[PDB]
Amino acid sequence: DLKSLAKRIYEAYLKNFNMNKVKARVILSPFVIHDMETLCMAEKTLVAKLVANGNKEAEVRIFHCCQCTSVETVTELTEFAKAIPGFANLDLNDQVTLLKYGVYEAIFAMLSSVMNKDGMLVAYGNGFITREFLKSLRKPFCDIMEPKFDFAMKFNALELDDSDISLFVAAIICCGDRPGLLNVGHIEKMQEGIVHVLRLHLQSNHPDDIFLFPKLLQKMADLRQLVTEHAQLVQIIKKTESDAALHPLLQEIYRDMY
Ligand SMILES: CC[C@@H](Cc1ccc(OC)c(CNC(=O)c2ccc3ccc4cccc5ccc2c3c45)c1)C(=O)O
């Protein structure tokens, strides 16, 4: 029954997220964006509407694309959350709170799947932007990217697959210590259930690493810190860059988070 639960989560993940580790890897083994010329060419083909004006600064244009991917992932994560035992039975306000505080942690966790030490896939697997090009961007835009790569490199070293990641993301969403929850007790039990499944699955899927579970619990805490830091950086950008507008949805997610 618990082995069945793990599969249900895995199937929901495969059905709700446009990208997964297997697909990402097939592609990585795509138009390359390594400089301004290639960035511009990529934009004209992939996000034509965004460069038809005559346009925002390259850094802001990239920042907008990053935001748009987040908005899309929020929709994917919301639909995914339904296959998690008990989630749909939670109060509507609790579901919203869980999604609000968990989306960015899940985003950076899953972002690792399309990242390697040299760069990352973008625009639904149709592009590959170099890590070095992202580092080249002027401050503070170049500071948004690198920390995510740093986390990704160590996360990817854990060699998790989609069956593991699906449960990890589920566990991230099922967090009882999120601010403003109405029914903390039911959420903690829901959490305990998912974490229990995650533990048994890692034991079965990774007999070679007896520290995998504790390692992942730590990544959960690392993600929370990574997000707090990301939120601060986004705030700095929002105030000091008069041309970088924040998407309304993300603005709502960011509100009173940290
Ligand atoms: C504003 C940051 C964002 C979170 C965030 C932080 C980091 C990060 O990759 C390091 C991504 C995902 N970032 C991306 O997916 C991404 C990056 C850079 C791009 C550069 C050129 C692009 C041209 C055409 C299409 C796309 C689509 C996505 C895309 C690009 C482009 C998202 C948020 O806070 O919502």
UniProtKB/Swiss-Prot annotation:
Record note on what altering residue 221 to T does: No effect on heterodimerization with RXRA nor on DNA binding
Posttranslational modification: Ubiquitinated by E3 ubiquitin-protein ligase HUWE1; leading to proteasomal degradation. Phosphorylated.
Entry GO MF terms: DNA binding; DNA-binding transcription activator activity; DNA-binding transcription activator activity, RNA polymerase II-specific; DNA-binding transcription factor activity; DNA-binding transcription factor activity, RNA polymerase II-specific; DNA-binding transcription repressor activity, RNA polymerase II-specific; lipid binding; MDM2/MDM4 family protein binding
Effect of residue 94 to A: Reduced heterodimerization with RXRA. Reduced DNA binding
GO CC terms of this entry: chromatin; nucleoplasm; nucleus
Induction and repression of expression: Down-regulated by aging.
Residues annotated for indeglitazar binding in this entry: 70, 104, 254
Domain named NR LBD: residues: 31-256
Required for heterodimerization with RXRA: annotated segments: 94-223
Task of the protein: Ligand-activated transcription factor. Key regulator of lipid metabolism. Activated by the endogenous ligand 1-palmitoyl-2-oleoyl-sn-glycerol-3-phosphocholine (16:0/18:1-GPC). Activated by oleylethanolamide, a naturally occurring lipid that regulates satiety. Receptor for peroxisome proliferators such as hypolipidemic drugs and fatty acids. Regulates the peroxisomal beta-oxidation pathway of fatty acids. Functions as a transcription activator for the ACOX1 and P450 genes. Transactivation activity requires heterodimerization with RXRA and is antagonized by NR2C2.
Similarity section: Belongs to the nuclear hormone receptor family. NR1 subfamily.
Identification of the protein by name: Peroxisome proliferator-activated receptor alpha
Organism in which the protein naturally occurs: Homo sapiens (Human)
Gene, per the UniProt record: PPARA
Residues of the full protein shown: 202 to 468 of 468
